[PDB]
Symmetry: D2
Subunit: 393 residues, 4 copies
């Protein structure tokens, strides 16, 4: 292992700072000081730290307290060299956000959420963040008639497009990244998966600077294939940031360390981030952000153990995935299975729809029964990936 | 109840024609003749019938057999007055489609699937169908390294855009509707949910004539809110057709009658189709297609019972949903909950992002603690919908 | 439908007292005085109230304080007539319980947990409770090597049999009801479904006074049929108590009002509680207790509304379920479908295994193809159930 | 890793013989001769073979035919040395079984089903099988009013105890293993998880020779922890047989190769089969049987590859799991985390309930806040497990 700043491992302040309060209990750990957080993270090899406004500045802080807090925060960063690649806003914890921020049924709450976002964009720019994340955790319902579903999407669009136009207007060097989640805390959250968030961006006025922030556990809560979903985000040129962690099944958001959930899927997620596609195409080159929470049963030694473990897991997987694609038995297994063949266009250069209809050999004279005998050998190809993952090859 | 042709209830030939073979067993019923199917459906009050190419014409039929089959098929339609509003292609049952049609790793299978589609578009136009459905049931994988994920999306786009351009080229009065499904028969299917299919259409060249065909059970297999998902399809002006049925949970595709799954959700799905949105907006005005399968434990009297039951359920729900929105106690409950308030824009006419930042009353001077006391009364609003559904109000 | 004490509607103090704090936010409501809870519940028609030791008496309460609180609560009960049918222990909120109470890895903690339970049994006995519920919420793990799994079950048995032995020794009229939950707060909880609960009971020294307390949402969190699960509990004569609420899918514990989740499943649970089994069998006669949470979006008028909605939902489903079984049309459908034939023993009186194998009629000359023609008509029977539920009959 | 008969790897004839037909398509492979299956499995290192009556002898086979087939199969076994450790009955493919075998609503069908089982017990006894498996796949319903649920369990008990009584009367060395499945082919299956299976067993007249046959994918279809479920079965001494395969989430039964689904859960099941419980306890000693299906995409080279992959996966996980527990670092972590402390009884020898309540140290003066400071370090122990699994240690 041994991580270093060129690995681009970023951690949020609320991950290691998570004190243990869940739905059935109180915090099991003492609050973590943010200057301490910076120092410890930089000592482990992180490249940067991210935060929610209220993670650093209390909802209630006076103007004087904000500047005291920020001064110490900026010095620590200076002292350590940590960057601040992403900033986000808390629009879910205070009781006023109980029906949402942007899609709140109450118009005056909608304005208060939008103004909270606009000011946070100014702090984002001041920190040097390149990405502004939006997780609409209270946007949704428990009951289907609680909302006008079309109106709720117009209210999401107005917030996002107002914030985008403000970036554009001030010339900040920022992009917005929406973060999908199917449920929790709302029974149903608007833009529940990667797909829904991607579709939504194409209806915006300022869509050009809006992309996604997929999170491993979140798509797994709908039982979806995380690698498939980020592949589609990537393919669309919309993969602006990523949140890595672990989930074991369809249940509450667990936020385990990356690799302590669905292991095989974590492997293939690292193969796509690191290696990209077999035939060539787009590559994700942003930071590798860890959005997890250290288990409440463990003390502060577990908090720092857990932060090291995110980084170890990703470097271990990376290693096995570089060996796997490099392996000449794998390259030949891939060629047998048609992996490279999928990269050839279906139509010949210049062929038209009529052309192919009239080509006797692709339809009228085609031997469907003989084409069906092909052994794709997908099981053998899967067996080679796992043996590479078990460090057996 | 009593359905009639202006209700626009359509049924596929494979629904009532489904003989009972599942994964653990053989058919429990005798094949159903398609001319018989037409006659029985028209006697029950259906408006039209849909089919998959191989539902009517065997994979193997000679040219002479196709014309014999079609002649009897067109006469029956003539004799009864049934329309053929949608046509689809089978790209999943024959062994050649074991890795897909359009995204098959084998290039020669990809061409054979595209040519099967092109010819089926010609038959679609000849029948008077307005919608051409695409369900990519074998497009996917069991193993994550079986495919180049970016290449698979380029191969889906080439098929869909070739077929779209062919419609455009021939001037057919047809639209393509993609049908999402998360898994089954593939471990992971490409375009698994409504969101993924919507996003995918915005990357097409001929996107303008491509929309969706959501199916109740399919989004429920990812645990998603069906009403939320069709609302987003509707909002985007992409809801071209719909498949109605029932699913009880995350498991194999059940295809129960509409209303024999998640009942409350079926109610709200009928409220959106029939009533549209509380504040006004788009409306779905196409056919109400039933994609279900009569339970294998029941005989042919159950097949026709089951077909009547789809229609009864939808008319019963429609009735309760018209009474519910008409109810002045509901209208007032809605007004209390902020349902109409969500329709007001957040920003005042002419207000800019800077304006709102500088409005002291929406941020600096806002009383967050007092705005948080609002009783949204969503529980009471839900209680009134259910009492309307139980026929208690 | 107006509930009367006769109905046996019970509520926990923690249900209407839930303040609204979840994993992503703070409480939206002020604390509820217990005296008020009791008077309010008495005015809505409740039969009784239930609590957890610490819902009433704080963890750190001095003796003078405990005494005061108890005097206020017993006063309230005397004034209103409410019964206290069940009492339970909080073995999950204090940080000491982060790895469980009975199955904590630390033995000193296991001893405290058990001491905490014994004292609470004393109190339960003084309040006149007939049921003692155990919900082991922190018993389990996030990771598979965290526990010696055979030892976790011995530890569980030790605590549960010590509690049972103490009851018996003291002569208290109390029975223990175990409550399953598959996950949350722990990634995996021991004794996760009704089945595991019932199995464990059979390995107990004192299993005769140990039974189950199934909760609607908890079985639905694993996707199981709640009506099937309570029928196995009844069939084993082990249905001691029941917790009713609603759950809309596989996700975090929603604790919605009973009937506000899966509606048809609620219909059929009410039928089973009220009508018993179609061929006869045991019947459940305890409290109809609701363990739900008033959505956090709602203010105090919402709290009493939701409390009320639980009892109306139940009464409304009861009216329909009684009508359903009293309908002649329904009885005829049940007979046709073989619902009373299931009650006839397969063998003849004094017919042995050998006698049957040798009966030629049942095996060797049985006409399987003819027997397979039966039209069970399950679809039509389900249609009739739903038409009774929608009150269209 | 090369399997030897010593390993006890068993395979069903139906596993490598699966032809590829699913609900959406026809078979992609030709039928497998049983003689060949036996010789092929013998050359890969299998210990034994298993079958369903009709996998071998067709439903309609004449006596001369049955005799031939049996002569060919016994020849093969004599030639290769394969054992036949388990035999089962097909009570699900023929249309007669559309509502179940033992719990069919039709009594004539219940009698046939039971006759079919008795005859198969005879055969199982002649083949030298030690285990008789029952998988009640059609036992259940799609709709909640289809069954009298108490009567369904009496019917189940009647069949299972008749089969058990017959074994005992005939003096056969056979034990019955019940196999749970939550859904598919039926919407809801009776005895859906290990827990329900174990519970039912305790109501049986002859439960002493009746145990369980859990299948990896089946418990994962309800989202349960397979390793936790088999540990309860072991703890009750009721783990008679096991079926290994892989499942990637809550969906249709995938029947993937063991290790090709949830990898860490497979690691920890292998640890439990091989290392037993950390503090000691019962150990499983039967066959390691694989009930999977070679993906239908793959031709016959894929079939033998997949058969082989099952035994390599298992051997590879075994090597890692043995190394994991033998590591000193791991043993130290286990001790710290309190894995051996769980094995110490909570009470002291001859310490009663009263003695404990009165012990001041355990209750009244227990320092809960100090006890809560323990760092269980479960994260670090899980990290060590995964590093042994990836072979980076
Ligand atoms: O605990 C929290 O603060 C949230 O879970 C976040 O981690 C969100 O998932 C989102 O990434 C940023 O708001
Ligand atoms: O059984 C089938 O023929 C399929 O399940 C269809 O019903 C698809 O869902 C799709 O709508 C049309 O191909
Ligand atoms: O909210 C709570 O305090 C708990 O969730 C309980 O309600 C459990 O569900 C159990 O029924 C009683 O401990
Ligand atoms: O494919 C099959 O024939 C069945 O699914 C079986 O394999 C069951 O899973 C059970 O283990 C044996 O009846
Ligand atoms: Mn998360
Ligand atoms: Mn996140
Ligand atoms: Mn379907
Ligand atoms: Mn469909
Ligand atoms: Mn609950
Ligand atoms: Mn409960
Ligand atoms: Mn299986
Ligand atoms: Mn099996």
């Amino acid at each position: 292992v041994q991580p270093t700043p060129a690995d681009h491992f970023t951690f949020g302040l609320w991950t290691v700072g998570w004190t243990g309060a869940d739905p059935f209990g109180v915090a099991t750990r003492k609050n973590l000081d943010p200057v301490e957080a910076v120092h410890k993270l930089a000592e482990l090899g992180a490249y940067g730290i991210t935060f929610h406004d209220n993670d650093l500045i209390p909802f209630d802080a006076t103007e004087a307290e904000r500047e005291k807090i920020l001064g110490d925060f900026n010095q620590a960063l200076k002292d350590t060299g940590l960057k601040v690649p992403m900033v986000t806003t808390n629009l879910f914890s205070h009781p006023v956000f109980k029906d949402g921020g942007f899609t709140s049924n109450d118009r005056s709450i909608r304005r208060f959420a939008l103004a909270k976002v606009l000011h946070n964009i100014d702090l984002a720019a001041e920190m040097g963040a390149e990405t502004f994340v939006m997780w609409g955790g209270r946007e949704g319902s428990e009951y289907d008639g609680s909302k006008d579903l079309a109106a709720a999407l117009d209210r999401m669009r107005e917030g996002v497009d107002t914030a985008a136009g403000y970036i554009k207007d001030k010339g900040y060097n920022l992009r917005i990244a929406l973060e999908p989640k199917p449920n929790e805390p709302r029974g149903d959250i608007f833009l529940p998966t990667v797909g829904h968030g991607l579709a939504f961006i194409e209806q915006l006025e300022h869509g050009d600077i809006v992309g996604l922030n997929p999170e491993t556990g979140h798509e797994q809560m709908a039982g979806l294939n995380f690698t498939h979903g980020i592949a589609q985000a990537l393919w669309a040129e919309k993969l602006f940031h990523i949140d890595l962690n672990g989930q074991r099944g369809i249940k509450y958001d667990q936020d385990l360390v990356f690799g302590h959930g669905d292991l095989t899927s974590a492997f293939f997620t690292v193969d796509l981030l690191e290696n990209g596609f077999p035939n060539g195409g787009p590559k994700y080159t942003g930071p590798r952000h860890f959005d997890y929470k250290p288990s409440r049963t463990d003390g502060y030694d577990g908090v720092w153990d857990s932060a090291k473990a995110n980084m170890s897991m990703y470097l271990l997987l990376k290693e096995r995935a570089l060996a796997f694609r490099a392996d000449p038995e794998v390259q030949e297994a891939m060629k047998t299975s048609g992996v490279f063949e999928l990269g050839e266009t279906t139509l010949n250069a210049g062929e038209s729809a009529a052309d192919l209809m009239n080509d006797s050999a692709s339809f009228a004279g085609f031997d469907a029964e003989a084409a069906a005998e092909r052994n794709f050998a997908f099981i053998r190809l899967n067996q080679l990936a796992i043996e590479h993952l078990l460090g057996s090859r």
